[PDB]
Ligand binder design. Structure first.
Ligand SMILES: O=S([O-])[O-]
Ligand SMILES: O=S([O-])[O-]
Ligand code: NI
Ligand code: NI
Ligand code: NI
Ligand code: NI
Lengths: 100, 122, 570, 570, 100, 100
């Protein structure tokens, strides 16, 4: 596979997001690291899908809403940042105030 | 325009190995009952005793085959091979201890080969 | 007996006139010459040539012209040429480039490249071999950055920092004697070559100089510490005395001066201009004009490299995040719009292609990617071929000129700028054996093996429990060169002459090889290999248009790059 | 007051006559004798016996017959016996096997096994304790291999390599003085005992000998470097002078000789024949006949161990992959068919059972599995019990004879072969405290705790954040013995006498314990514990049939093994 | 669980294959490490199922076809190798030219 | 996310349990580490769901039965222990003799 260090690390984020999605599916309000994981994996998968940085800045604000998360979580997440390989190479996505 | 990452686009032409060196064809027989495979750069006179050939014709020579390849002799098999000349200083040391110096010392090489039972000393 | 060229290349790697595609780019390199004697190629394995009495000599002791290591059948890509050779290493250094084996029986053996009892073999047939990359813009923020660098073929990190302190997160600076001493000690455990920059700030000499005497290898002037005329001047007076290089990140804000003021303070003295295009920092909007001057050694950092459809959106927001800017402080919006400019980013692609920007670097973890200097160099070269055509200087349909121009940007040129090219930066006899093997399919993307001081330090290799090393998972892993005390002999700490004379290595208990920085003040643009162009670069203050020789330099952003989604899991 | 035997075994581990199943095999070991005094068993915990004034002595200083460490109630499985005892460790060495505690109040206390203020306790009740495994066929290719080895109870790695260089990927060789010095330095960071082999190739003595004087512990003759009569001869002349062992991987190709020629070159001198069955290398097809000779110390590597239904398919393809063979070079197909033979693989199972192959080894990462030497030893013994019946020498229905015969193959016999059995290889007084604790359910599969020089180096232990150490995830992890400078005192670098006399450890700054290789040239097959059989082994050159005492040695491959899918996640 | 080093590593391959399978399911052409991951995990799961080495050498050539992967991927994968615990212990599987 | 060391490790257990559940779903009798993984992840997810320690001590004995696992597995597992964050902080759950 030729995994580099970032590729190994970033598999953890996907895993954490899968964990969190299972938790959400069984009716739990998500916590801080769960919410961060879901939004982060969504950004990275979106890059893989070939979306633009601008599309993901917009979409990342609609992945989870306040009723999906525990009290205070929205206000604990000022932004979520992720780097991924777009069709035009690595770029940084920052989603500002993802959960209103 | 399909892209194979890292592919070669080789030039035209062919590569001649061992160019300019004398070539010699000899017949060689594996008189033993187990297979013998011989690499490109072994001094030919020092190969396995049970290979029968004119030992003198292996002195100062090796197989004229691409570097890192080999010739195989199944038990009882006789075939012809093509030899090329050794280069550099034309000295051989070690291997079967038949030479240990210049390959020009044919009588000495053959004497040792004969005494130790290397088949085909004529 | 003749061998067709396809089969010859499959067995021994390519020979004269043969071309090799670089990864999934449309760049092709062509073998210029070959040091072999056809039929006497070295190779290693069962029934192969490097065996006792044959291609391996059984007579000579190690001292007697015998190698510690032979890389067989390498395709070298270097500022010095694109050619086929064996590479011989001894005492950690490259001692021979030529033809290895046994003079007993082989023709054409380079006399100090004897394969003997003492010799280890690496098979380089079918590989491209380059020098290790020299990254001169490293923020030391997170030790996990080292493996990221090694995985993309970087072997020297020059820069500064003390970990994730704000000074270090903004600037390549290890400030003052104590932090310098502490980071030289930390360096003992980092498996890569290192040189440390002190703070190029002050209005008296002694506070600046004491950093050099403490073991800094250079200085960094950064606007975040006040890139004022005084700090510029003092730093360059120190550098001229100490024979070390000064890097600059100039006054973006134009607070104490415009570009011309910074150039007046420099006063013709040698300086390395970091992120010269300016998105990474510098006098707005015209800093890139530095790259026209003969006393400036200009580098780019990597996030602008090359200009792509997501670049501007990405950078405007990255800048806002980094500087805590707000979308409703109109001064912050204006600042960002003055700093992140498609006009200068697109021109930066072309300036690289023309040999006017001489170097690449990362800006690792401050505004750049530790593992993408080599990656993005080749993406730029590929984009420029597509947009500008093969350059004039090419022939035989190969991209050799461009390939030498661009490999120089991350190998030899940074080493010359830093005063370390006596040790590192190219595949030449007498230099340290920092060598990177690449499969052509992965060239510039993921290194196969990274050799440091003649021992493999990092490799893409598989399951450690397996019968052989190739089964999954194949991932980048630290090798024996990084383990135990071998980490000391396979890596260099680069230091000032004065700290070396003053015994700093012994005072601190440094066991690493100690490299001397020198010959940094007596160079210029003309000394940048393949990238020596001086010219008047005009940057329009209203439109940000860049002109060279009266022609606007512009190109389009691309939607896709090679060396991207085919290779990466994320 | 009497205790029934079930409850006694639950509390203290088994006693005389009790049997214990080895993992999920059908092998049973029986307690032969017990050093305890019933009612005065040592144990540690709240209200237990090892408390001050009671089972712990409160009077004696450390020097006064007090232990650093007591393993209580161990079931020892060793060439010397299968028996129950306390094991006492001091200064990193086994000082007492017997009965520990306090002579104040207990009967039967071995006089130098006092539990005192200075004494740490490991509870071994219910555990099987063996010596650390001695792997004498290690390719040093990927440092990640060390933990793989430790996890299956290996504590000494003898072999060679410089990392994933082709020479090392093929051969257990660290060639020449410089690579040797570099790998001795690297060894400073590896948490396992090590000895390094130089290249056993040359036609002059000095190039070979200089490796021994540089700090090699032995030599390797490998066909890939030319396993010629000259290289064999020179290597053994060096070994005889230097008192180190020579391993051989002979000329598979029969290029310069057949087996008889290699035996003539050896000329009755002592040699360790690696992968003696020959799938891993050697004169085709009859190399395994080496194992009949009195001057040969024969080992197997592990992928042929034992003969299973997937073995041949796996090996034919593994060989093709390893040697870049092509399915339409008829010479390559013939080569593979001559090398990978069910006839010699099946006979190899039986030769082990008969005590004619004396040793096991891995061939780690070249053609063998770093973590499966112990595993596959027991799988072989289990298969042989099933196919051949309890051996003649057994009694009481136990498998003790077989268990001593097979534990010797990876503990004492490799240590004797290598000249290191004064230090390691068995649980005996005066030897280094390299000890492996096994839960019987995991015996030979996953070690519980691996003690190196009297401090735990590796353990299967759980969540480091938990209130206690047993919660998930329970995984193999490096322990305090591997951390800081303790790695130096818990591990041995084995070296030649001459390098030790010449001061190599001081020259290189080696801090590890230095072990001396000796008494390697004055031994033979007769010195292999429980595996001392010499006989004429005939291998038919046409059919590959193996005969011993006029009887064909053949057995079937098995479809399933114990110590396999019940235990492993992959 | 008593995880050894290989067991920990090899969990990563399963994870990478799960990631890649999700990507394939949403219609993407797979890339080099994705393809390697899917084929490798298939081999290891097949060993767990009790297939023979010979069965897996055959089957591994039919897990992905060229239309499943990006241009050039087939030609980048000369072989895929994996070791796993079969009913008769660890064995090496090599799938030659898995994607035609 | 701010992952601490235990959070990183414990993601491995979830992954191993997902692997094992796939194996069970395709009809395999589970082995020792597979069984341990499933039971352990069930405990940790149960804590996340807000069950009590006492509820999980009870439930953990009914997650797998002997017909779900290979011969000898039940008797190899004396107990399974896991720590997880309950609503009232980290607690230790021990499931005794989980598989009868
Ligand atoms: O760290 S940024 O100023 O090159
Ligand atoms: O490395 S193999 O020749 O035992
Ligand atoms: Ni900057
Ligand atoms: Ni910077
Ligand atoms: Ni071998
Ligand atoms: Ni080997």
């Amino acid at each position: 596979m030729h995994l580099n260090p970032a590729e190994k690390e970033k598999l953890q984020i996907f895993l954490a997001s899968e964990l969190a999605l299972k938790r959400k599916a069984r009716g739990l309000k998500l916590n801080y690291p769960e919410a961060v994981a879901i939004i982060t994996s969504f950004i990275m998968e979106g890059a893989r899908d070939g979306k633009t940085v601008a599309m993901l800045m917009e979409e990342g604000k609609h992945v989870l809403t306040r009723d999906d998360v525990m009290e205070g979580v929205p206000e604990m997440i000022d932004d979520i940042q992720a780097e991924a390989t777009f069709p035009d190479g690595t770029k940084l996505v920052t989603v500002h105030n993802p959960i209103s | 325009n399909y892209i194979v990452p890292g592919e070669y686009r080789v030039a035209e032409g062919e590569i001649e190995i061992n160019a300019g060196r004398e070539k010699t064809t000899i017949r060689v027989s594996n008189t033993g009952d187990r297979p013998i495979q011989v690499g490109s750069h072994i001094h030919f006179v020092e190969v396995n005793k049970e290979l029968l050939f004119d030992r003198a014709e292996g002195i100062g020579r090796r197989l004229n085959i691409p570097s890192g390849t080999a010739a195989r002799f199944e038990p009882g098999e006789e075939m012809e091979v093509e030899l090329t000349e050794l280069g550099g200083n034309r000295e051989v040391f070690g291997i079967s201890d038949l030479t240990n110096g210049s390959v020009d010392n044919k009588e000495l090489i053959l004497q040792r080969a004969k005494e130790l039972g290397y088949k085909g000393v004529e | 007996m003749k061998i067709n060229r396809q089969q010859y290349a499959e067995s021994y790697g390519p020979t004269v006139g043969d071309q090799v595609r670089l990864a999934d780019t449309d760049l092709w390199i062509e073998v210029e010459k070959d040091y072999t004697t056809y039929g006497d190629e070295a190779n290693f394995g069962g029934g192969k040539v490097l065996r006792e009495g044959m291609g391996e000599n059984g007579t000579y002791t190690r001292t007697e012209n015998v190698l510690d290591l032979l890389l067989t059948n390498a395709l070298i890509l270097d500022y010095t040429g694109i050619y086929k050779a064996d590479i011989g290493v001894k005492d950690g250094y490259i001692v021979g480039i030529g033809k290895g084996g046994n003079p007993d029986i082989m023709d054409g053996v380079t006399p100090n490249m004897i394969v003997g009892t003492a010799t280890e073999v690496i098979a380089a047939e079918g590989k491209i071999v380059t020098a290790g990359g020299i990254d001169t813009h490293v923020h030391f923020i997170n030790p996990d950055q080292v493996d990221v660098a090694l995985a993309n073929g970087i072997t020297t990190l020059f820069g500064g920092g003390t970990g994730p302190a704000e000074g270090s997160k903004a600037t390549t600076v290890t400030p003052g004697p104590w932090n310098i001493e502490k980071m030289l000690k930390s360096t003992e455990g980092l498996p890569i070559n290192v040189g440390i920059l002190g703070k190029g700030h002050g209005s008296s000499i002694a506070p600046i100089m004491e950093q050099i005497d403490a073991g800094a290898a250079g200085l960094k002037i950064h606007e975040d510490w006040g890139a004022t005329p005084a700090s510029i001047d003092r730093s360059l007076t120190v550098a001229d005395e100490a024979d070390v290089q000064v890097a600059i990140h100039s006054d973006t804000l134009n607070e104490a001066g415009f570009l011309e003021d910074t150039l007046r303070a420099i006063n013709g003295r040698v300086i390395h201009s970091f992120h010269v295009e300016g998105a990474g920092g510098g006098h707005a909007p015209d800093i890139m004009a530095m790259a026209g001057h003969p006393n400036v050694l200009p580098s780019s950092t990597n996030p602008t490299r090359p200009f792509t459809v997501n670049t501007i959106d990405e950078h405007l927001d990255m800048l806002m995040v980094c500087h805590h800017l707000k979308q409703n402080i109109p001064e912050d919006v204006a600042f960002a719009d003055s700093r992140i400019r498609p006009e200068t980013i697109a021109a930066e692609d072309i300036l690289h292609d023309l040999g006017i920007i001489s170097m690449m670097s990362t800006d690792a973890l401050a505004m750049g990617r530790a593992g993408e200097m080599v990656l993005r160099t080749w993406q730029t070269a590929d984009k420029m071929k597509k947009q500008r055509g093969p350059l004039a200087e090419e022939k035989n349909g190969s991209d050799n000129f461009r390939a030498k121009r661009y490999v120089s940007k991350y190998t030899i040129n940074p080493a010359i700028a830093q005063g370390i090219a006596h040790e590192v930066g190219s595949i030449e006899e007498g230099k340290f054996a920092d060598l990177v093997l690449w499969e052509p399919k992965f060239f510039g993307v993921k290194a196969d093996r990274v050799i440091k001081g003649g021992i493999i330090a990092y490799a893409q290799i598989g399951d450690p429990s397996a019968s052989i090393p190739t089964p999954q998972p194949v991932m980048g892993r630290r090798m024996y060169g990084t383990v135990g005390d071998l980490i000391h002999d396979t890596n260099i700490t680069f230091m000032s002459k004065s700290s070396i004379q003053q015994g700093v290595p012994a005072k601190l208990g440094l066991k690493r090889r100690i490299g001397t920085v020198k010959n940094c003040r007596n160079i210029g643009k003309k000394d940048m290999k393949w990238n020596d162009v001086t010219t008047d670069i005009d940057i329009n203050p209203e439109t940000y248009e860049v002109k060279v020789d009266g022609e606007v330099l512009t190109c389009e952003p691309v939607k896709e790059l090679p060396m991207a989604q085919r290779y990466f899991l994320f």
